[PDB]
Symmetry: D2
Subunit: 332 residues, 4 copies
């Protein structure tokens, strides 16, 4: 399937790298009115977090050429003006962070795209997490959401725990890497006051809908989870901390066994499992959605436990966007 | 009361600063074999986290002289060799991190101190937290512990919540600033592997007895709390995230009211309360043990809630060590 | 003199703090379309770098009230629309970063301001550095620049060295704290590619005209200095490293004596002098423009030397903005 | 050649990595009293800065097994007690930081090593920089030093500049990543007070002999260079900023031409050249000694110029240790 990327940012660029690394997906067009062609060569080639691109990137005849694949470059603020159909882009990855509703994301369809994958939670577009509910996708859905990074970490874990022991209720904290929405020094941040405080100086509480959204991809958990976030001074890699009450008793060793088993079978590549003494950097460019840290979590008793799972918020999620597109392509 | 300080580190220096600032106790001696007298002047005068000392500090005639008051300086590796009595030190603050059992800390009694306050949890010394169980201290107790920074944050909050609504069970995460036990780049850390990894690069999970320890100071909560820590790349100020189930139902606004009332009355100066859109730097040099962050926390329902409280791990704790000594002196 | 502030950012806010320590200057109005009145209370009260404001600040009757003084609040994007005159603002601090020419900064004169102080270098407005050429100001100048932070650090040191020994030529590096122009993670930066790279991850080279500008305020040095910058991951406080060739020979101890003398005499409060083993955080909230670090520098020979001077780029600069206005007011 | 590593730290472990890429070098023994066998598996497998080891590592029958090769593990504090000869180690890399003199490093010969390569400057052991004076090595030298990371950056550049234009005199600053000698929070650093101050909080000036040491490896530059350092809050990658006066005039474009020619021929793989808008992270795990940054430097005139060159202080250096051993082995 031929793909367009709208917003060539952290997500858009790393989706682009994921497509090339793999390849039942072919990137054929990119729109970003804030990054011109020669600037795109530079932004793609060099990455502070994930290293230099391994391959060739060059501007040739007005196109962005990556490992010899020519890509059509647009510069449009309004998605309805991008000529996706002319460029052959069938699916568009909407990774700007400003077109997340059905109405706004649907502008791509006016440019000749057939489907849109919103790289963020959406107020109304249906949400999918690979490994949890992606089989619920069907051919009639032209606009879909791949949820958030944090939902993609929590939901595969919550699926396994709920399937085996039953989650009565749970409360989640994510300790999350800084993102582009933050500020280098104390400055204005509209209505999200805390988010405007200097990113590398602070632990910053933030709200997040990611735990409540698990109740949408796992409908039995509707109303049974919520949570909040702390942003902290690292440039990538995040961690979930799920505190839950279970219906059936589970010794921590039984939790470990069921999770490990899930990592080796049905959720292989989505949900990882470790007993090693890891820290966040050990998940740098890790492609899993969620990796359970057996050593880090703790039980109070057989029904009340705190479970820890790591996620490379940029790189795992960008790989999942690609995997969702491959899955949608298989149901055409 | 006349006080000696063993280990002139973050805690020993800030305890000294606290003492001089308030006049509540008199620092008359300091022992640190790794910091000679002229170096002590420099380490006291300049502080990256808390600013330059606002007062005078000089070396004169072999003495550290702070605001014109002379302090006897020792340089002994073995605490049994420190001549407290010669200096007139009555209480010793054991702030080295290496003498935390009653057997080890009791060495200070051989050179003439009368009582010892260990600036850390102790496997066997009686544990006190100001505002929670300090009234259980009595004159028979020559060696005591002021718990950990984390315990002094969680315990006042748990006291108020338990007294009003009943904590059935709870699980705590603390997101905690870097400390001296950590490493600048990946290096050896003995038994605690994860703590050797580069501190400013990583989110580092860690075990902590701080939640379990609340049960030592609030015996009704024995067996009912536990938790863990993440170390993150900030130089000071930490936060507790307490997920708990309550016996009697409590709307989040009732929780707020009850905590606010506590902070204004019997736990004033120990337990603070805010509704402001704060971040960690807002607690830089804050003397509270625990400041409840109303806006940051979230309830799932009337019996299951996540409560957030901030603590200056260096400066709140150091002030508590001074406060505990004042209380002990009042009982002689 | 009654003052307005256009751009209530790191410098706007700190200039406002500094003005409340003077009362040769009274802040009577602030404009910032991105910070509404109640948001201003918050942004002013809490400061990650320089701590909580130690006076009073509240919103009353649509005004910002600081230490009991009511301040008119504007919300205009176009400075020609700001009604300074109505609010009584005789001088306006232009601290937005986007109105740095005489043409653009003169828009304030339309709304009734009498003079404008641009908190940055200007292509065409006369530039002044306190202690170096501020006496060349006269009361016919309606638009003036206070130069950059870096020029305020270099120029006083260069003045002393040139006066005593003669600078034949110099090349300067500044190792500079992160600023609001930088990005939390790799993102777009228009024509300044390097500045888009993640700020907390990187040492970032940058061009700067600050050394060349010293030739505007010390005309004998025109054409004799230039330099560049590295941005590094600290939130505030910067350092100049001046490599210069001297006309007359100077042993490093003669340089120290002459700089020390200048710091005690005519440039007191502007140029500081230390022999202590300082680091950047020892200059946190330091009001000097430049503090020579005697220990840090190094001579190759009597005609070729590297001199080191620290500056709190936010706080020292903001104090100079106030000091310039005080000087300007004394000429009215 | 069979090699042992004393001090399995940042350098020892990355030399070990680089050796496993060589084929002319085989690691056969490692000594580190502070890292036991099972801990060495962990410390080698995971690396915060350079990523997970791309190979296999396990403990088997008391040996460390890397890529199928068994390595004897010692736990000795005194290097004269290590049985190098028995384990087959002909050369020892001395990478502890504490045995840098001929007399101290020479202890390894008592245990049966044949040659010692000190991973640091030595007061008396002959010093080699690959590409600059390595051909001055002969089989009579049983103890050698591979200099410092900084000298390996400056010396290749200085060779090219001096060869084409003549360096009359120069002064160097290096803006250097944190290293293991620094401290996470303000703490004791006996001799070197500035180095004890919190590493992630501060720009820290430091003395360095690295520029003076270029005159050992390039004797025509003896007495013509010196400099200093600033340690800044990044975990790896550093930059040299050389300010020099040239004998023959050199337009900046001619400097660029000569450095580029050198990078392409005789110093290929040692001295790199870029015109791209690079920042420090672009050199993460870059194996060059020195990469000239053409965009970053600046000339005042044809005889006085500031040249900028990057270096991964951990990874380029570690590769140079291996390249020096390969050269030495070639002459045996
Ligand atoms: N970074 C993460 O960890 C992460 C993880 C999962 C999902 N997300 C989501 O993905 C989205 C993008 O986040 P990001 O971190 O990559 O942000 P980003 O700021 O790095 O990238 C956003 C990009 O969109 C471009 N852009 C802005 N307006 C545009 C327009 N009108 N048309 C086309 N392009 C435009 C920008 O120039 C920028 O390059 C957001 O919805 C975010 O919440 C981010
Ligand atoms: N930093 C915090 O946030 C914090 C908070 C609460 C409690 N504590 C506890 O207080 C203690 C000190 O912690 P810190 O952060 O100040 O550590 P630190 O490393 O800054 O200070 C420890 C000091 O002890 C000194 N020392 C070591 N061996 C000694 C000996 N034999 N005799 C005398 N002095 C000796 C060191 O030279 C150093 O100056 C530890 O038990 C720690 O757990 C720390
Ligand atoms: N931060 C420093 O170290 C420093 C030092 C010396 C001088 N400077 C200079 O001072 C200026 C401000 O720098 P800063 O660091 O305070 O930046 P900043 O981004 O913190 O502040 C800029 C402020 O201007 C406001 N603004 C933007 N457009 C505006 C408009 N049209 N009208 C009114 N306000 C508007 C923004 O909302 C913001 O609050 C720049 O010229 C900068 O180069 C900064
Ligand atoms: N990190 C760099 O950027 C870099 C670059 C060039 C050279 N160097 C030099 O290389 C050396 C090592 O530096 P590093 O950064 O790897 O330091 P490091 O602290 O990571 O490693 C030193 C190792 O030596 C071990 N050790 C200590 N005492 C020992 C003993 N008696 N015997 C055996 N092992 C012992 C330690 O346990 C540690 O694992 C130093 O001389 C340093 O100056 C470092």
């Amino acid at each position: 399937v031929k793909v367009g990327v709208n917003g060539f940012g952290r997500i858009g660029r790393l989706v682009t790298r994921a497509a090339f690394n793999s390849g039942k997906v072919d990137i054929v067009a990119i729109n970003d009115p804030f990054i011109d062609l020669h600037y795109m060569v530079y932004m793609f080639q060099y990455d502070s977090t994930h290293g230099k691109f391994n391959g060739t990137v060059k501007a040739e005849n007005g196109k962005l050429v990556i490992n010899g694949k020519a890509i059509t470059i647009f510069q449009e603020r309004d998605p309805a003006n991008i000529k996706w159909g002319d460029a052959g882009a069938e699916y568009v990855v909407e990774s700007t962070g400003v077109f997340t509703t059905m109405e706004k994301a649907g502008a791509h369809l006016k440019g000749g795209a057939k489907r849109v994958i919103i790289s963020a939670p959406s107020a109304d577009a249906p949400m999918f997490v690979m490994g949890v509910n992606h089989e619920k996708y069907n051919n009639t859905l032209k606009i879909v959401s791949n949820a958030s990074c944090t939902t993609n970490c929590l939901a595969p874990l919550a699926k396994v725990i709920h399937d085996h022991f039953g989650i009565v209720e749970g409360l989640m904290t994510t300790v999350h890497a800084i993102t582009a929405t933050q500020k280098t020094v104390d400055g204005p941040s509209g209505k999200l006051w805390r988010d405007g405080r200097g990113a590398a100086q602070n632990i910053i509480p933030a709200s997040t809908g990611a735990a409540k959204a698990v109740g949408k991809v796992i409908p039995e958990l509707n109303g049974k989870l919520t949570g909040m976030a702390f942003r902290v001074p690292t440039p990538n890699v995040s961690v979930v901390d799920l505190t839950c009450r279970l219906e059936k008793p589970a010794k921590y060793d039984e939790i470990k066994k069921v999770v490990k088993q899930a990592s080796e079978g049905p959720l292989k590549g989505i949900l990882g499992y470790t007993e090693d003494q890891v820290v966040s950097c050990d998940f740098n460019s890790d492609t899993h959605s969620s990796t359970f840290d057996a050593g880090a979590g703790i039980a109070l008793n057989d029904h009340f436990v705190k479970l820890i799972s790591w996620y490379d918020n940029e790189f795992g999620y960008s790989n999942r966007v690609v995997d969702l597109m491959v899955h949608m392509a298989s149901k055409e």
